[model samples]
Target chain A: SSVQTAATSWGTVPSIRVYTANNGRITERCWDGKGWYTGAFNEPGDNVSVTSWLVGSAIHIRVYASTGTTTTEWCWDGNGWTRGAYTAT
Target chain B: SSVQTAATSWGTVPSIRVYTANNGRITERCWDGKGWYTGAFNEPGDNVSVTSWLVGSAIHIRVYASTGTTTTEWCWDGNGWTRGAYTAT
Candidate 1:
């Protein structure tokens, strides 16, 4: 048997936050194992949410739409803030 | 929100076959929704098995080893044979 390449990705956190605004941006924050990662989107009227966020793993995501603004913030270890993003709303 | 590309494959059969020989060629046949796909490997002393053969979904696979010969065949809808392979054993 020949070894075929197996496609896999790193694990992700268990939860994510989504923020939407009237502008044209969407923000997402996710737990990155030890800390939180903040990301944003500038597409207006968009719907954002965490696709797969496993505990102790990196966050996986999927986004739909992009007509309004959105913002995202991250909090890790149930403690301090790590990163934040503000998109055009 | 950002729209990311979602990857997917067509439906496949639900089962597969494995044949081992003393030669070094390995062959595999899988149902790819509509028909069977025939492929082969020349590595000797290998272990081959169907990884994921979902009914009505494209088959997903993984292979290991390559020391001997292996062959595989496919029967779609339990009807006629589609393809077959013969490896060096």
Candidate 2:
């Protein structure tokens, strides 16, 4: 698991990336307006990496799988995680 | 290959982690006071994940193997990478 430290307008938040939580789960964490919040990036048997960053005023997540050629990603808009952005390129 | 952007006392530098560079190689990168430096974390077959961070004015790396239970790591002390720290936990 890897984490990124970021500062939001609220304060400072931490985002964590879990490549293979439990060896086959994709758990992701982000600092909410509160302290921190965590959820799954997704589930994959051959997960490779999980990463997070702040985009403009938002939080975004990216995930990779050694099983495939590309990775998948998502975003956190405070309310919820949004649909995925394909990284097939 | 995943790259982490970091800043040192000198300036901004980028450190990178590679799960399977060239499909089965471990290539790591760090920003020296001069520029970016790249090298092999090691040769890993079935390398699962590679992660890096700044540790007390140093850069360190951790790697996992999907084929085994433990992970391995190394450190950069300005001049070169260290021996290793086992992550058998």
Candidate 3:
């Protein structure tokens, strides 16, 4: 699958965040008003799917398992990434 | 908020779909290997949040209410839109 992107901001700086799962890892990149910086994590596996949205000041990323029926939510609040609850769709 | 975009395909053609909520409605547009066309719906409500993901051949669009807590899911299966269940998150 292709990378999923979400719009966000830090303070007054406009930004965009992108996520993709590959090689058993999830890669994330952010454009922070200047340039892009990125990071990766071993999570949810490579065969899964990812989508994201923003609420208030937090960015919520949901990764889908291979079954494609369940998902786990991970959130980034400008400070750090936190694993959140799971959902079945 | 900015419009959310998702990559999709129809048979051998690649496409991108965009969604946004404004004026008590949700607007959806698609680039179908040629041009962009769009439609709108009065659903869930205008102050709601929207996120989407694809599973198999289905496109799932979830709308969040003004409280930003609960959500209703709507799906597009290349034929028409179907209102699905709700979730509290």
Candidate 4:
């Protein structure tokens, strides 16, 4: 593969999401202005992965806890999924 | 009452998502772009809840589970809830 972006959101809407490391898990892409639409893995850590963003945009996405301890953040607002919890690790 | 807007997606799908606090619990709504529809929980939780994406939009959607540790993300991309899991706290 070779797709590795992670998170991108200009807020309000207009998308861009990407991530890749296929075969062993981690393969995802999205950019709804015409381009990129692979799928899978951006925040489901098993380790060696990381992403972050508070309100979730501007590539606003964050992940890590893949057996990697402590941390929380998530995003994607073209219609769902918005969480920034765990308080903190 | 106003829909505080927990999440929304102009995603690859097309639509918006939102959340509303209830008399004693929480409420949820997903883009009906065909997938990610949900039900239950007008009043459930000693803590908050969440869901997520990474492929088709990028998600992490988390919830509450203090002490003993935590994690439990869920998603449903086209029939009802995809998945975000942790074997244990």
> Which candidate leads the pack in lDDT?
3
User: What fnat does each of the candidate structures reach?
Assistant: 0.04, 0.00, 0.00, 0.00
Sorting all predicted structures by DockQ, with the top scorer first, yields 2, 3, 4, 1
- The digit string of per-residue lDDT tens for model 4 on B9-81 reads 4546565455443433446666767776654324332223233344445543332211212222233444444
In candidate 1, what are the lDDT values of residues B1-89, reduced to their tens digit? 22111111222222322222223344433323344344343233334332323454434433333333434433333343344343444
What is the alpha-carbon lDDT of model 3 when measured against the actual structure? 0.46
TM-score of chain A of each: 0.33, 0.42, 0.54, 0.31
Question: Which portions of model 2 miss their true places by more than 4 Å?
Answer: A1-46, A53-62, A69-89, B1-14, B21-38, B55-57, B64-71, B87-89
Name every residue pair that clashes in candidate 3: none
Q: After superposition, how far is residue A79 of candidate 3 from its true place, in Å?
A: 32
Provide TM-scores for the models.
0.23, 0.43, 0.39, 0.30
DockQ of candidate 4 (2 decimals): 0.04
Off by over 4 Å in 1: A1-19, A49-60, A66-89, B1-89
Which residue segments of model 4 deviate by more than 4 Å? A1-89, B1-5, B12-14, B30-43, B46-72
Q: Least lDDT summed over 10 consecutive residues: which range in candidate 2 chain A?
A: A2-11
Each candidate's lDDT (Cα)? Answer: 0.32, 0.42, 0.46, 0.39
Clashing pairs in 2: none
What TM-score does prediction 3 earn? 0.39
Per-model TM-score of chain B: 0.32, 0.43, 0.56, 0.39
What 10-residue stretch in candidate 4 chain A is worst by lDDT? Answer: A1-10
Candidate 3 lDDT over A1-89, as tens digits, reads 45433333334476665565554455667787879887543355333334444556555444332222223445454566676433221
Give each model's clash number: 43, 0, 0, 28
